[PDB]
Amino acid sequence: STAGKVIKCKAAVLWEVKKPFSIEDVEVAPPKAYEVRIKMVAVGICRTDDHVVSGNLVTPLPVILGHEAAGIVESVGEGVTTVKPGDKVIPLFTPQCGKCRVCKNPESNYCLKNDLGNPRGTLQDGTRRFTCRGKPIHHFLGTSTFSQYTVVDENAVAKIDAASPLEKVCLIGCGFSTGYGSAVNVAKVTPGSTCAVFGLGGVGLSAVMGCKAAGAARIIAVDINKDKFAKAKELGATECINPQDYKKPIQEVLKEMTDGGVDFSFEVIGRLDTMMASLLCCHEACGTSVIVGVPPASQNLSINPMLLLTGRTWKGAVYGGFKSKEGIPKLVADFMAKKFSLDALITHVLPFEKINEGFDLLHSGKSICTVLTF
Amino acid sequence: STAGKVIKCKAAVLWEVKKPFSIEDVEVAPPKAYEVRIKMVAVGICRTDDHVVSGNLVTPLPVILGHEAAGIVESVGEGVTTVKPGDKVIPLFTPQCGKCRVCKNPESNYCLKNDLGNPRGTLQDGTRRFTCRGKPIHHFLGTSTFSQYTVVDENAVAKIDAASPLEKVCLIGCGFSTGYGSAVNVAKVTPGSTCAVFGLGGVGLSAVMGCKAAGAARIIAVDINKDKFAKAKELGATECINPQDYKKPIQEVLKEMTDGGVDFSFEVIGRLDTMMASLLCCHEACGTSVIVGVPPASQNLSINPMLLLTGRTWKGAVYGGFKSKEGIPKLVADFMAKKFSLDALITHVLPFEKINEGFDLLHSGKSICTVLTF
Ligand SMILES: [N]C(=O)C1=[C][N+]([C]2O[C]([C]OP(=O)([O-])OP([O])(=O)O[C][C]3O[C](N4[C]=NC5=C4N=[C]N=C5[N])[C]([O])[C]3[O])[C]([O])[C]2[O])=[C][C]=C1N1=[C]C(I)=[C][N]1
Ligand SMILES: NC(=O)c1ccc[n+]([C@@H]2O[C@H](COP(=O)([O-])OP(=O)(O)OC[C@H]3O[C@@H](n4cnc5c(N)ncnc54)[C@H](O)[C@@H]3O)[C@@H](O)[C@H]2O)c1
Ligand SMILES: [Cl-]
Ligand SMILES: [Zn+2]
Numbered sequence A, B: 001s002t003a004g005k006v007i008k009c010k011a012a013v014l015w016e017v018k019k020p021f022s023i024e025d026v027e028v029a030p031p032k033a034y035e036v037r038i039k040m041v042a043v044g045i046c047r048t049d050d051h052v053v054s055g056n057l058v059t060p061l062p063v064i065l066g067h068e069a070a071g072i073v074e075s076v077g078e079g080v081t082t083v084k085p086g087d088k089v090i091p092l093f094t095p096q097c098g099k100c101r102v103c104k105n106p107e108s109n110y111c112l113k114n115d116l117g118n119p120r121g122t123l124q125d126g127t128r129r130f131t132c133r134g135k136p137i138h139h140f141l142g143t144s145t146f147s148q149y150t151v152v153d154e155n156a157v158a159k160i161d162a163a164s165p166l167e168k169v170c171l172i173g174c175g176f177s178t179g180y181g182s183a184v185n186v187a188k189v190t191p192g193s194t195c196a197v198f199g200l201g202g203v204g205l206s207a208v209m210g211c212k213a214a215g216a217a218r219i220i221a222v223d224i225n226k227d228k229f230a231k232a233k234e235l236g237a238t239e240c241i242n243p244q245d246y247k248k249p250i251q252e253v254l255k256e257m258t259d260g261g262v263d264f265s266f267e268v269i270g271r272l273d274t275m276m277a278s279l280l281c282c283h284e285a286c287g288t289s290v291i292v293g294v295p296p297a298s299q300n301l302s303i304n305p306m307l308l309l310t311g312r313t314w315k316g317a318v319y320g321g322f323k324s325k326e327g328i329p330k331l332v333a334d335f336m337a338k339k340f341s342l343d344a345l346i347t348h349v350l351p352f353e354k355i356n357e358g359f360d361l362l363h364s365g366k367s368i369c370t371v372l373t374f
């Protein structure tokens, strides 16, 4: 079959920034001890993959991007015990090693084995498993899912329900868990509260769902693209506003609309201005502002400390606060039990080969979550 | 009786910024409905009072400062149901109107009837009560305690135990509650956690106490004034560090000795550089940084939101997060229950008239909490 042997498959390689994805033939090496080789079934296009392409997120190039996915274990390396071939799995962009200070803390999830802080672009052992034209290709967030087959560390993969529809549940790999957890875990939206969500893509809309689920009484959705309004309202938004319709700065508008400011603001775009407006629109005395969007590299915000002194809370989080390996499978169970649906988010489905077309949809703002099938 | 009549007394008025306080004769008009005229018995010198003197905190001048205090109800206005003459009381720089959005929210205390956000220098009805040489003198934070008599709104005054040593219990009026509550109420320091406290003035030392009461395992006290360490140690600090002894940045020094960073850091000074170090020294994935120090006017920080995205929580609070009308007396009760001691804080006791000498000791750093008696 393929276990123990090198696999030669297709992968979308980014050789340089601001350049189209090149579909190459790569050699995927067999998994070492404590690694799992996965056969991809469905991958979602997260903006963070785009952040690398536009040059806003730095990470070693050439590289195989992708981190929102679902697939089947092709083989496991010696030592692997949490999963076996044929198992349906979801690769996790933030591992859960279970040994570190962070992992052993019940309230934090940014595991110390991540590759976000200082991007080595390798697996946890400091080595790569891809080769294209003889040249070694870097991994992204230790998942590199834009490939027919990838190898990830064991603590970076979760075994999910065998009955899970992979083309739906892959969104739980990032988009959904990130947005839903931001509301539910990170901010911890109280019942009867008012929330404002800035940005309405797959992640932001999921944040709307999580606010709805938290029992928020009012959910104001903000986006400059009005086409997103139908979905937003459908998912729980009590009202949607377009900053371009006003002469006043977005935060004053919200302050006036909510008797002084929302209780929870969510920045789910990744811009300095929306991050500021987001902190500004929540009530000075009892507002919590949560940053979900990923900021452009080495950009700084100028903030007057007095904004926080009155009683505001500013915080950010990766993966919606979910301890990865432990939390994702549970969200899949919730999906199976029909606790929430992912159908409104998936607007486009294309074959992996059309990956570039997928990104064009994101750029045009015509798509929410686009899924690539292998 | 003096009730109904205008009281003529001595008060430390400030006419110009950065000039000595003038002990003059002012006229304290009688309390209007819902107001209380209090006879000051002991006022403490809080660093914020100094901020107005130095120009760091802007407020209308002329003004009678002072807010950390205790006294006896001289007389009450019409409709006053919470206090009666003779009742030992404590004025609150932040009131608890009890009927506003912030007051109805259990997790917040910045009552909308405060005079910090936008200083008017008046009592809640928009008018002044003091006069000096034919001119009206402004109030400060609605309290104005550097006067033998003062008039405060009912919701900005709390009655305490009719046996409380007002010469000590006055620290609960600001300094102690602010620091203590910041650890207990705002950070919500967890048992076995590791904390860092930048600034060992009366408020920092109080935070140390609160960090120990919460059951922190390590309390690293940071200060350039070496003479504070003995007190810090005495109050619970596991170790004291002086930034000047190092050739390396204090934040780095602190991360290196706490395996990545502390769990809860507190900035209890009011400088931007210290507020930055304080944010930087708490673990990037599970650290909560709390701002206690009132920063200088108009100055603001430059931060990379990536500092928050990984898991950090940044918040600030006034009055240690305590809802003034309810928390202050409760605190006194605990003091009355001998649960804590303010003796280690009060380092100098001066007669009201020696007020300028008080601020001199504060500027020299050879004092923690100086009390002025009447
Ligand atoms: N934290 C975490 O974890 C995360 C994050 N993230 C981020 O977030 C963001 C967003 O996402 P998305 O959803 O995917 O995207 P999109 O689709 O693109 O959306 C966007 C939106 O928004 C809007 N806008 C823009 N601009 C504007 C707006 N609104 C308003 N205003 C303005 N100006 C548009 O229209 C649309 O709708 C980003 O940043 C991302 O990145 C994600 C995820 C998660 N992670 C982490 C990771 I290292 C990976 N991932
Ligand atoms: N948030 C509030 O409710 C609230 C309440 C009371 C006071 N405050 C503010 O908290 C701050 C301090 O209060 P305080 O009464 O304890 O003041 P304080 O001046 O007596 O204490 C300042 C301490 O900081 C130390 N310090 C100064 N620069 C330092 C540095 N660069 N590095 C390390 N240590 C340094 C000084 O040696 C001193 O020990 C002030 O801004 C005060 O206005 C805020
Ligand atoms: Cl007047
Ligand atoms: Zn993502």
Ligand SMILES: [Zn+2]
Binding pocket: A095, A096, A097, A098, A099, A100, A101, A102, A103, A111, A112, A113
């Ligand atoms: Zn870990």
Ligand SMILES: [Zn+2]
Binding pocket: B095, B096, B097, B098, B099, B100, B101, B102, B103, B111, B112, B113
């Ligand atoms: Zn109020």
Ligand SMILES: [Zn+2]
Binding pocket: B046, B047, B048, B067, B068, B174, B175
């Ligand atoms: Zn004070």
